[PDB]
Ligand binder design. Structure first.
Ligand SMILES: NC(=O)C1=CN([C@@H]2O[C@H](COP(=O)(O)OP(=O)(O)OC[C@H]3O[C@@H](n4cnc5c(N)ncnc54)[C@H](O)[C@@H]3O)[C@@H](O)[C@H]2O)C=CC1
Ligand SMILES: NC(=O)C1=CN([C@@H]2O[C@H](COP(=O)(O)OP(=O)(O)OC[C@H]3O[C@@H](n4cnc5c(N)ncnc54)[C@H](O)[C@@H]3O)[C@@H](O)[C@H]2O)C=CC1
Ligand SMILES: NC(=O)C1=CN([C@@H]2O[C@H](COP(=O)(O)OP(=O)(O)OC[C@H]3O[C@@H](n4cnc5c(N)ncnc54)[C@H](O)[C@@H]3O)[C@@H](O)[C@H]2O)C=CC1
Ligand SMILES: NC(=O)C1=CN([C@@H]2O[C@H](COP(=O)(O)OP(=O)(O)OC[C@H]3O[C@@H](n4cnc5c(N)ncnc54)[C@H](O)[C@@H]3O)[C@@H](O)[C@H]2O)C=CC1
Ligand SMILES: NC(=O)C1=CN([C@@H]2O[C@H](COP(=O)(O)OP(=O)(O)OC[C@H]3O[C@@H](n4cnc5c(N)ncnc54)[C@H](O)[C@@H]3O)[C@@H](O)[C@H]2O)C=CC1
Ligand SMILES: NC(=O)C1=CN([C@@H]2O[C@H](COP(=O)(O)OP(=O)(O)OC[C@H]3O[C@@H](n4cnc5c(N)ncnc54)[C@H](O)[C@@H]3O)[C@@H](O)[C@H]2O)C=CC1
Ligand SMILES: Nc1nc2c(ncn2[C@@H]2O[C@H](COP(=O)(O)OP(=O)(O)OP(=O)(O)O)[C@@H](O)[C@H]2O)c(=O)[nH]1
Ligand SMILES: Nc1nc2c(ncn2[C@@H]2O[C@H](COP(=O)(O)OP(=O)(O)OP(=O)(O)O)[C@@H](O)[C@H]2O)c(=O)[nH]1
Ligand SMILES: Nc1nc2c(ncn2[C@@H]2O[C@H](COP(=O)(O)OP(=O)(O)OP(=O)(O)O)[C@@H](O)[C@H]2O)c(=O)[nH]1
Ligand SMILES: N[C@@H](CCC(=O)O)C(=O)O
Ligand SMILES: N[C@@H](CCC(=O)O)C(=O)O
Ligand SMILES: N[C@@H](CCC(=O)O)C(=O)O
Lengths: 501, 501, 501
């Protein structure tokens, strides 16, 4: 998208890592309380850091499918497993003609660090199939997905205990259903956990409430934790809260649409929505329900009645918050000086080059990094995986017990008070509030997903802020996130003896 | 080695394939006895040929080893499995800093076509570890080999029934022994065929007589089959036989040395020997046993007392037969016009670019192609694999029975003659000749390897010659070999229904 | 059986090994082609020899059976796997109250060296169940055998690719049939080689012709090879051949009975037969079929009509050849001076202590050692295992072809002779001798077992004699055998890198 500043994607992520490694290297050496206090301490710390960076296993595939017209075609595919310091590996499947070994390796490493940031016990992985799904029938896409699943399974690149895929660009519920069905019907036929081989499944198939919207929901929570922190909003020259703010959204897919829904719900105003074919704009606000309904009907956002076909880059629209939610390397050395927003919330994976990060720093623009902000997807995938391993819906064993227990608890307060203020205090009814009445039976699956996600995004934001203050990083939240990720992954490699050697 | 003519190695091999595919496409379509004779027959033929060309599975590895000095290093590795129309896959392991995904994919496809040429029932595969072995201790090389084996085994890229490695550049007997030992001691502990997981083993560990020298022995047999056809020697302006010819050898490794031993044994004269550091030259002849003894003593060819340090390209030395036995892409557009030899016998894999083949054709230079000429290695690896599966040394069950049987057979002739020519004819002793006495017990392992190899190289040469005449290919033996390979591999894909789709 | 001289059985075998190790160390060090020509050479030779001696894996079992009367009883069992330099492991199952961990470890190591002596590609193993089979019903023995098989199988101590048992003291065809049936019906249900999990099976279940008598047949061949070498019979002061000699047999089981049958068949005369309850004696000779038919009828040897209940040790009976074919450590310090025989042929495993070997050497008594002499059992077990892996009876594919081929061969001689001695010489019939007519179709299973065994015993006797001359060992054949065994096993450990460490 830019021939001036177009770094190799894997190496760009390695650069981000190098930078966080630079900052913590002292802390790692000093923690290390080995008798070698000689600066082979320094040496073993940077030997371990070199082990963490490259992907351990990458599988490249070519397999034939026969198209609906009868033609034979060769499909190309890839899956990278970056780290196995936690198992299984976790990461999505991308259907796109931009798929390549380097793109997949880069996203696989992002998954490792992202999972470490939100304390999700998975190593990183990613897959890609180099096709444009719009050029294939549904029957052909099913054939490609099912065959890809078996080629991965034959070589140990999918399974509930090694590698658990998930949706990404141009895949969703539908593909995940296909993956889970052919895994469970063949190699997983005797495995009690066969349907935990993949997440993002439909509900009828072991999916979890809110997985489709989960990463949008997490984008809201990530922004909210920082947009409500007066210390960061001072440096930006902006007022805490959502009620008065504007935002623009690049990409109207699963991440972009649901980020818009939740931000709109809490008083922000969507001004611009950009897509693969063009952009639309309205300074008075775009309604997400109307835009979705139009998009579902016409297969495009152009021509939306209540906004005007906007020319020029969606990334340079004037707004408070820019949400790049499409592909990677969209903000570069070129357009970074014209961005006009004061908060960049990366919903997409790797939308900002390192050169663009430098410009944004100089310019007091806050980039909330992908490592943290889009990790709501993998957090709720983690909940889905646990739901599959546990083989019950949350609360089903305890709803009645817990309901009865709570009423007897409140009755214990009632009877204790009547016992004391006897006859002429009268009857002293203790009853639930409206809000407690609605929790009287304990959490359900929906409650766990919402509160578990909010808990994770908040706990992770505080850890990033703590680390940024400690090292005087200002608005370089990306380096603070990598610092936390590196510290966690380093400790695992260090206390494990590294490897089987 | 040449920046004028440096084609991508994988695509260069696909180019060779495309050529042979051109020539046979008609014969494939006409053979095809299917009800719908539309030249959409031609469409299925060219869909199948597109399926055959790319590698099905490629695994890329990164794993850490701790060096002898205590530092951590990250080792990079690769194994490509090109085709599974026959199983297991078969191919060597190369230790070299020139190793790359493309190099490994290219050699893996060469293995498929090579195996089809000599009727060896294996699909093609190849592996590479990106190190220079003369920078590592023996203890480090053992560590790297054993760990590489486990990483391949975990993902299904080594095993007696999927993929059976073998030596290549900078690996031999020693590494194969390490591979077999860690496979059999871990995931092969219950497998009756665990030691058939790799070939080129030492004899004490399941190796077969003559595997080290097998590919040199096959180079001799391949040359002999063509150097003794007067029709091809006419076109070259040359006398049949070896007794009178000179040759030069690029590379003094396992292929180069043994090619020189066998050619020297049958009256050819080695004039020049080139190496990674320099060449040596002597128009009176170099003796292989003194050269190897010098090489073993000094670790180099230079300074050999009975030849001179030759400057300028070994490939340009003046001789009848040039044997490139080092790495690939050594003969290019550049130096092809200065070659001076009349026969180029490719012992190495892919030593000649397609441009250089152009030039050699115009100038009536016969290139005996790698597909055919170096296939003695994989042929004797095949014998080793069968020896492992059978769990007896050849002849051990039958030596005594067979010898007793032969003497009673000769005695049947004796007694029949005496009965007829009674007393007046006397005693009529029927005894073995010296050469039959030597076979009186039947074949041993040594005999099977020697005669089985000779049988294969001759039968394959006659098939290549038959095909070159039938398509008027003259001295383009490479295209004739690919034609035979394609025909055989196409038949398997066609009658199998292609794939489970 | 003797308090004076009753060494620990495992260490006694280690003593034999140490003794052969002492003689070959120099040869091993000098062979060793390595740069550290230091006595770091002798150090690694000494370290490898220490690795070879102990057993790698020993499993000890306790499992309950409910007896026919309804009581519960706890059965004790053991299986030792001594070496895995060849796989699978091979060794018998002994039912005896004298079974112990040390006894089983000792016999397991004997199996390793024995297999190396006759070039049988198995590592050594042995099993024992500590019961007296005479105190159990057939139903109880079946339950014990089947349960023992499952306990071994669960832990990887039986299987066609790890460990293949066989009969020993108080087990035979019957028990092996039980073992094979429960293995193949449970854990081996999908294994193509399930019935190769054990040898010594009945013919109807994959057994091989002559396995029951095989170790007796090998005892005859082992004696033959030495009793016909005039150089050894000189030192003994006796006449080559069998026709004039006497022998006594301790133990009338599977080894003892069949040794007697074959020796009797070639003109030796059995004077004395000893068993667990007593011995019998007759200087005119005992006939083996009469004595077996009496034993089958009465369950004992005593009271045999044609011999006299002999008192005093069977081992001291006056004869030329003493065949101990019962348990171990029967010739000791004590009774070695009173032996009276000139040749001691150990059919049993470890019947002679090292002190008794000392005495026999001083008195010019030839001990043909167990390592060599009783290895006909494991040699024919090896043939049975191969028969199972091959899934055809020998010759079944080729009988008709070979018979037709031989007649056309003889007809080629006949027609060639007529077409030269025309009608001047008449018809010249070329026909098989009686002996060749018997072989006209090629070998059958019976022929391979007989000639394969004879071939093995005589090639092994040669190697022992060669090695005894070369080191001036005289009549210390035991040390010569261990020397050959050690050289072969050392080579494997050396060129394998020892272990994955
Ligand atoms: N799928 C998930 O749960 C998660 C996805 N992500 C990342 O979010 C990003 C996008 O989210 P997806 O779920 O893939 O959405 P999606 O694949 O459902 O839709 C992507 C949208 O972006 C549009 N698009 C593509 N290129 C564009 C361009 N140059 N300009 C404007 N629009 C463009 C497409 O037309 C489509 O509307 C990806 O980078 C993905 O890796 C991150 C975390 C979780
Ligand atoms: N084995 C499999 O293929 C699947 C297993 N599961 C397991 O079930 C556990 C609980 O999830 P749920 O309680 O189902 O969520 P849930 O109770 O919210 O169920 C949602 C939907 O599943 C339906 N459902 C329940 N039992 C069914 C049955 N026997 N046949 C068809 N539909 C049925 C419900 O009626 C509802 O429509 C999960 O932990 C997961 O491990 C879930 C889905 C598929
Ligand atoms: N080893 C085998 O079983 C078979 C090997 N081949 C091919 O034969 C070729 C080499 O045989 P290897 O067994 O690997 O020999 P090797 O690896 O034992 O020795 C290779 C020799 O070539 C020399 N060499 C390397 N680069 C050179 C250069 N640029 N110029 C001159 N000399 C150079 C090296 O110093 C070494 O002496 C490779 O292309 C291999 O793929 C083909 C069929 C079978
Ligand atoms: N399980 C393993 O690791 C090995 C298995 N084998 C199997 O053996 C079969 C036949 O090969 P061989 O007959 O060995 O070829 P071979 O008869 O040429 O013997 C090669 C060498 O192995 C030695 N050898 C024989 N038995 C031995 C033992 N028990 N311990 C140590 N060394 C011994 C021989 O003395 C000879 O020097 C092959 O089909 C193969 O499947 C062979 C070698 C290693
Ligand atoms: N059966 C086989 O395949 C082979 C067995 N062996 C060994 O040969 C020896 C003989 O075993 P098998 O004949 O198979 O067993 P078996 O059970 O058929 O014969 C043993 C016989 O010796 C008798 N006996 C036991 N203790 C005695 C003593 N102190 N004095 C005299 N007789 C006694 C028993 O009552 C029984 O009659 C054993 O040491 C065994 O380890 C060796 C090679 C092969
Ligand atoms: N799967 C099993 O349990 C058994 C398998 N086999 C396999 O057969 C191979 C060759 O041995 P054989 O040819 O049996 O030697 P063989 O030809 O001497 O057969 C021995 C006896 O088995 C009988 N037999 C043959 N086929 C039979 C059938 N379908 N049903 C019942 N009885 C039959 C024959 O009449 C013969 O008398 C062995 O390598 C072995 O693994 C042999 C015996 C049992
Ligand atoms: N695309 C889309 N998804 C919706 C819409 N409304 C609800 N969902 C999603 O459907 C799932 C179930 O929705 P609800 O039953 O309303 O429960 P909910 O979790 O309170 O919904 P939300 O708070 O909006 O996430 C959630 O993942 C919602 O985000 C919608 O209008 N459009
Ligand atoms: N490197 C090397 N190998 C040799 C040499 N001589 C023989 N060999 C190989 O070592 C193995 C054992 O040699 P031999 O016992 O003579 O068997 P062979 O088949 O008659 O030997 P060749 O016909 O020369 O291959 C064979 O594979 C030989 O090719 C040599 O001088 N140098
Ligand atoms: N216990 C016992 N076994 C016998 C007897 N006779 C033969 N056998 C064995 O039973 C099997 C059948 O023997 P045959 O069919 O005659 O074939 P064979 O190979 O010529 O037998 P042998 O030369 O005695 O080994 C062979 O293994 C014999 O060794 C016997 O009298 N008693
Ligand atoms: N593919 C998403 C989520 C992966 C998952 O849910 O496992 C990402 O890029 O983070
Ligand atoms: N590596 C050799 C032979 C491989 C094998 O023997 O399997 C080749 O390039 O053909
Ligand atoms: N148990 C016999 C051999 C058993 C077998 O044939 O494997 C012995 O002591 O040698």
């Amino acid at each position: 998208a830019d021939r001036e500043d177009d770094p190799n994607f894997f190496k760009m992520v390695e650069g981000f890592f190098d930078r966080g490694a630079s900052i913590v290297e002292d802390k790692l050496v000093e923690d290390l309380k080995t008798r070698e206090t000689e600066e082979q301490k320094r040496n073993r710390v940077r030997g371990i850091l070199r082990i963490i960076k490259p992907c351990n296993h990458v599988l490249s595939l070519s397999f034939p499918i026969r198209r609906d017209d009868g033609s034979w075609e060769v499909i190309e595919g890839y899956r990278a497993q970056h780290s196995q310091h936690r198992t299984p590996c976790k990461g999505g499947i991308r259907y796109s003609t931009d798929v390549s070994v380097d793109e997949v390796k880069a996203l696989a490493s992002l998954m490792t660090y992202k999972c470490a940031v939100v304390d999700v016990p998975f190593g990183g992985a990613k897959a890609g199939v180099k096709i444009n799904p719009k050029n294939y029938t549904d029957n052909e896409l099913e054939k490609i997905t099912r065959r890809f699943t078996m080629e991965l399974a034959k070589k140990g690149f999918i399974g509930p205990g090694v590698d658990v895929p998930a949706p990404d660009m141009s895949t969703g519920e539908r593909e995940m259903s296909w993956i889970a069905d052919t895994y469970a019907s063949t190699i997983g036929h005797y495995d009690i956990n066969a349907h935990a081989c993949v997440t993002g499944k439909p509900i009828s198939q072991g999916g979890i409430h809110g997985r489709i919207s989960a990463t949008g929901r997490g984008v809201f929570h990530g922004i909210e934790n920082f947009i409500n922190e007066a210390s960061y909003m001072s440096i930006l020259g902006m007022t805490p809260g959502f009620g008065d703010k504007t935002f623009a959204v690049q990409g109207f897919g699963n991440v972009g649409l649901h980020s818009m829904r939740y931000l709109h719900r809490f008083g922000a105003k969507c001004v611009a929505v950009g897509e693969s074919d063009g952009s639309i704009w309205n300074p008075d606000g775009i309604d997400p329900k109307e835009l979705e309904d139009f998009k579902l009907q016409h297969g495009t956002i152009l021509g939306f009645p209540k906004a005007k076909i906007y020319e020029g880059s969606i990334l340079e629209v004037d707004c408070d918050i820019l949400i790049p939610a499409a592909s990677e390397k969209q903000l570069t050395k070129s357009n970074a000086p014209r961005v006009k927003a004061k908060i960049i919330a990366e919903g997409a994976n790797g939308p900002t080059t390192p050169e663009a990060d430098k410009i944004f720093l100089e310019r007091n623009i806050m980039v909330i990094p992908d490592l943290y902000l889009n990790a709501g997807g993998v957090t709720v995938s983690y909940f889905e995986w646990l739901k599959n391993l546990n083989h019950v819906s949350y609360g089903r064993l305890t709803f009645k017990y817990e309901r009865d227990s709570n009423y007897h608890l409140l009755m214990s307060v009632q009877e204790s008070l009547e016992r004391k203020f006897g006859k002429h205090g009268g009857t002293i009814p203790i009853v639930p509030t409206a809000e407690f009445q609605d929790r009287i039976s304990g959490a359900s699956e929906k409650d766990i997903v919402h509160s578990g996600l909010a808990y994770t995004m908040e706990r992770s934001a505080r850890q990033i802020m703590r680390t940024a203050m400690k090292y005087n990083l200002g608005l370089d939240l990306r380096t603070a996130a990598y610092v936390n990720a590196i510290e966690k992954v380093f400790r695992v490699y260090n206390e494990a003896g590294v490897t089987f050697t």
